[PDB]
Amino acid sequence: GQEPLTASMLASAPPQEQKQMLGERLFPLIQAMHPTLAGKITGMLLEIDNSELLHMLESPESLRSKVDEAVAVLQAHQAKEAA
C-alpha cells in the first residue's frame, strides 16, 4: 500500500502535477463508491480547487456530499445503461 497525501507533499510537486496527485489518490478512494466513472468525477472534483480539496481530504462530511452531488448531476441531463 501507499501513504496518504498532505499539504507538505502537494507543495513539493509543481502545480501541474498536484492535480494528478490528488486525482490519483482519489481514484481508489471513490472507486469504492462509484468506480464506474471514478476518474471522470475525480477530474471535475479535483479540478474544483486544491485549496478546498486539501481540507476535503480530512472532511468525510463534505467529501461524500460533493461526490453525491456530481453523481446526481448526471441523471439530471441523461442516464445511460453502461456496465
Binding site: 492535480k19 494528478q20 486525482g23 482519489l26 481514484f27 476518474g39 471522470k40 475525480t42 477530474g43 471535475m44 472534483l45 479535483l46 479540478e47 474544483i48 460533493k66 452531488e69 456530481a70 446526481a72 448531476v73 448526471l74 439530471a76 441531463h77
Partner: peptide
C-alpha cells in the same frame, strides 16, 4: 438545489494515452 452544479460534460483527470479508437 445543487450549490455547486458540476459539469457532467467534464473530462477525466487521468492522462490521455493510447491513440485511435482502441
Amino acid at each position: 438545489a445543487k450549490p455547486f452544479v458540476p459539469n457532467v460534460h467534464a473530462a477525466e483527470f487521468v492522462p490521455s494515452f493510447l491513440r485511435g479508437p482502441a
